[model samples]
Target chain A: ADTLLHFATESTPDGSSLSALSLDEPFIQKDVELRIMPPV
Target chain B: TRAIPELTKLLNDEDQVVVNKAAVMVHQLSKKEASRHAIMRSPQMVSAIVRTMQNTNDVETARCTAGTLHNLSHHREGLLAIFKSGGIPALVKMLGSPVDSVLFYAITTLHNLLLHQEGAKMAVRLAGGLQKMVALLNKTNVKFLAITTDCLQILAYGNQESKLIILASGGPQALVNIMRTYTYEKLLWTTSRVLKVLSVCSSNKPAIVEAGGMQALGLHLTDPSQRLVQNCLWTLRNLSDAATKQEGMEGLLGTLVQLLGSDDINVVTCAAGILSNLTCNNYKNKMMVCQVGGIEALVRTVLRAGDREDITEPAICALRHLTSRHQEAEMAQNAVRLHYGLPVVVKLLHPPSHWPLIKATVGLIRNLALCPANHAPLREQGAIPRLVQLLVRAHQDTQRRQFVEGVRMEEIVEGCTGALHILARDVHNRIVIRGLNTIPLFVQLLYSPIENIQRVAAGVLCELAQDKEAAEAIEAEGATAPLTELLHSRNEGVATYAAAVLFRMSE
Candidate 1:
């Protein structure tokens, strides 16, 4: 999930979530992850 | 009511003033709905027009007669009767006359003739008319270049034999004579169009070569004005597609590369088109373009034109043409990077609600996507979705508009369709092929209520159908019947191109 670096975040009604990449220094988010699951 | 008869009699009036009035009446009737209605009310008016065309010694009357016939032909029954009663011969006679009005009206009449599918073939058979028009071409000085070129366009619209008429009449020499006497700037656009039609005539090669048109067209490569040079280059590029043009290969390839460096955007695009055509043939010319650094120049042009989307499509097109027949092209095989080119092309496709630009950009990306290894990078750029997005967007935009109004927009859409076909080259040919449910809407646009939209829509479909997958998709969508119907369209270019498409599909 390390590649899940925080893209930057925007405020949402529920709180904050990862957004599109941004300018200058940024933070990487750890919650995001890639799936290794098989196709249904 | 009295006015029309008075005008009709004035047509026979001994005085030039009255004759002019009569001629104007015919012209007006030919051009306007109201006047057409007025003439239809007086049924004898058709006879009057016919008699004037046949017996009126006056050029204006002859001219007006042709105009009247053009208008009457708007109705099917009226058109057939006019032809049966010798309208075609009379129009051909007027085309032979030295008088500008006579010649002008005759040419306009020829334009109207093409509205009938069989009219072009019939015009080809008209004795002395085709020969005379080609004969008149040698006399193509500046004063009459436009009308002359138009006459040439009409004459060439007939099948392969019509082209033979041009070739027999010193085809290359006649064109060169006109070229020498005219300004590249003034006549390039029309002349290029006329020459293209002539080249398409099945047996124009020997005549074109013997008459020196290739040499003359090649000479324009170095013209001082870039746009004119570009137009000339574009004409030569297509002209060179014929087997005979291979004789002048070295000169054409060299000049095209030099012209590619011109500051004019149009020149760059035209040069790109030439490279594209040449690349399609597995000849030595492709290597020359690469050796002369065409790839780097193309890349630079694409990068510089990044902000200007208008240039982006043509630049991309140039790249596509350079790479089109890749098996024989080492430069294309080695240099073009799908990863970088795809993203840039995708970005270019973003703006411009104009259909042609959007479609062409899509075609370039698609062609670039043909390399299996590059497919991943190209897809990564979201090109597939962008193309899909354009198809949906153009459909919606077409509906909102008076429905894609002109030949120009059709070209834009054709360019976009070219992109879609190119992108779908191999990987997801099946998926992309299935995605063509949108084609029927495009066909409907081809048969749009408006004549202009119908013309271009047919052309775009032609470009799309060049690819097997797209052709299959179009056929599946039930587009072939309508596309074939256009082969007999009132618009000759539309019909000719439509037939050309069907011809490609048949192959």
Candidate 2:
């Protein structure tokens, strides 16, 4: 049930800050939905 | 090389560019064992890196610092230096870094440090380390899953208090979720090891089971990777204590039984351990094992893995479970005898054997005695005298040693008395046991504080007392006082046996 949505990261001028969150952590699909945004 | 001192000085350079560059260089250089040794040997290297990681707001610098420490932690001494230099708290702080690379390095560094005992203790106690690590599981990255699960495995390994902390932090559910969704072999294998250690705590079993962890584990039985299979089996072995979940594993018996023949000793050990647990107190699982030739496989495992206690212990335990159950009793007895397993099992009862192996070995003997045909082979295998010596030594051990390791004195007593109880069923075996001069020992046990000892002791006495000479021996051993004392016992069976012994003696 959990979904990942990727949004554009262009809104944040320094998209590198998103680097703090390891992009490799496994996504959980049970309850809350996830959104994976792209850098515009 | 002068690299350590140079890196140390560069780490303190006032220019942020210089400092970050130094960290990156250290990160790259620390990859080799010798370089790591040099970095760790430098008195101020670890401290300097810790300082840079602390003062720098630059994510790259932080990532490099964490990465450097992660490499250094590849060995024990470096890990020790890292922890001593306060790298754990620094890395723990960086867990919330906005840079995924920094976060990855931090978590991975923490994972490496945790591979050591002290590091694990420090990690578990780090203010929010446990919480942050579990939180990482909420994300969808295979790398994070692998690293986080590996970290959790270290925290939970043989650390009961840490396991409870993880459970209270909702670790079980999170782990089960990843296990259900992740098909990546590394993540699955890592998660399996974590769950394997976590399941050691009985309180964690139901949650693991409820989370569908049991079924997920069963699906991995066919994994070609022996390491994965070993971890899965370890989890199943730990979870085998749960009654309901044991039933759920009935479908896994065929695969598990075949694993007993695995060339890998650990695989055989774990497979036998799971099959042992599955058959415990669960009749259908035992029948499933029996139907699949589990008895002979287990007997063969015991014979094959005689050099490895880990393998033999579990294989003996599987044989015990397979043979001890009333339904599968005949099947186990025939398999053990037909495979020439009697001497092998009996040999393990000697002093060199591990207590758990001893306990299971005697338990199998007790079950084998249920069949009248087995009494002679058991006796022929020197079971009676060995059991007598085992009981005598256990009684002696209780009075002398505080710990006998791997098994308790009471279990030895139970095994011996249980075997004796069945062995006594054959009057000829009874004569052999009585000739061993164990009646006095049995009489002494009649007054043991433990009810199990008293009941089994009295039960053994009841069979021995059936013969006129044996009854005289019991009366001569001053057993009347304890027998009478047992008449008022709270346990009905004990009381009945006590009264039976007394009535026969009076005749």
Candidate 3:
């Protein structure tokens, strides 16, 4: 969970995808950390 | 008319009675048309009167000098002559009188001077006339009150410097006091008018409100005359926020509802205009408006528009404020739906309308769409096709605008896309927009020089790509490069949303 950020990500309507964004203005929280998750 | 020279000779006579009598004679003589130029030709006599008015210990001489100046002010040359002879400084000081007749003539004459050269108006304020007038507003005489307020109204008009001086001198407090004490149409008319002009200066807003301006002005909305109601409404629109307080909102919503139904279109316009400001970000005011059948009243104003009447723009705008974010927003949106306002609001989205009406209409739609229940019905009302059409029209206007006009059109573009963005949260609306062909404009906005437009437009397309077919539509429109470029945006939100759409499309 190293990539866990303070804000929630909106999943696709089918729950088949995730993006750390909503279809509104973007915000990057102070001191955020992001990295691709390792293969499950 | 032929006795002009004799009056000029007697005007400066050493005996107090002769000077007083001659001042009266000249005041009477100036009342005639033919003698005015003749007396004006005797510039020294004008100088003598200005000197005596300033130096006179006799009250009657001062009053006559003021009255003569009032009559002389009717002619252009007469005013110029008086200005050259230092009438402004003398006339401004006459506002300190204890007698009503003296003030009536002095203040009315000063009103005439204010309409002349800019330098003369500066002299009035420079000599502290603005503060004196604010202090003189304490008089108990009605005619004196009327003339003084009228003078103050002229002093405050289009003169921002004078407004601050007036405000600093307790202008708002004194005007609110007059509004509370007086009910006469003449007095209320000018007092509210002065308050309206002063209200335009933003810093004076709280001063007007803190002085109980809302309660004083709101009660006059139902006054017997439209002029009084119009001034009060106009002033309240400018002087708001004290309006959101519980006491000011107490009976004002009911009265504003009553005003929205007025036969006079302008009165309805002004009433809605006031509501538009009063309800902004204030939950209780919005709720208060809802409780008084104000929502219905406003919708009726929107529905009642004739070809010549234009209340729809402001009425719909006021409706938008009620639906703004708050606990009552859902209720207000539901009220709008139950009122059959859905199709009516979407109807204004069609082009060939001014940008303000377009902005206000789409703005309301944007807010209403915040409620998911409004989603399907808004589309069914034909909002989708027109909203897409709005994007094309705005884009065309954007390419052909003056600098300021271009800025405003960019805002309309952003708002139109904003509403569409919210609607795209539902898949069916997404297909509707994709089929209606709004993709090209979305792609174009990705290249906009304005940073905000770039983000908002990107936001709209991101919502569109949530559906699988729209993701294909996005790629078909060749949006890949711009989307890829936007991944470099300094705004993490814009970059993330752009990146999300690209990832969604690939998936």
iRMSD (1 decimal) for each model: 30.3, 21.7, 30.3
Quote the positional error of residue B338 for candidate 1 in Å.
Answer: 21
lDDT of 2 at B363: 79
Q: For residues B277-328, what per-residue lDDT tens digits would candidate 1 score against the true structure?
A: 5554444665666777767676766776666644554456556566656443
TM-score of 3: 0.71
Please give the clash total of every predicted structure, in order: 16, 27, 1
True-contact fraction for model 2? 0.01
| Cα deviation of B272, candidate 3, in Å | 2.0
Candidates in order: C-alpha RMSD to true structure:
25.2, 12.5, 18.5
**lDDT by residue for model 3 (A1-40), tens:** 0000011111111111111111111121211111232211
- Candidate 3 residues lying further than 4 Å off, grouped into runs, are A1-40, B1-128, B240-250, B306-310, B393-407, B437-507
Measured against the true structure, the TM-scores of the candidates, in listed sequence, are 0.42, 0.66, 0.71
Q: Give the CAPRI class of candidate 2.
A: incorrect
Report how far off residue B331 is in candidate 3 (Å): 2.3
Most accurate candidate by TM-score: 3
Native-referenced DockQ of model 3:
0.01
Those runs of model 1 whose alpha carbons end farther than 4 Å from true positions after fitting are A1-40, B1-37, B40-43, B56-85, B115-128, B140-143, B154-158, B184-186, B219-234, B239-254, B259-507
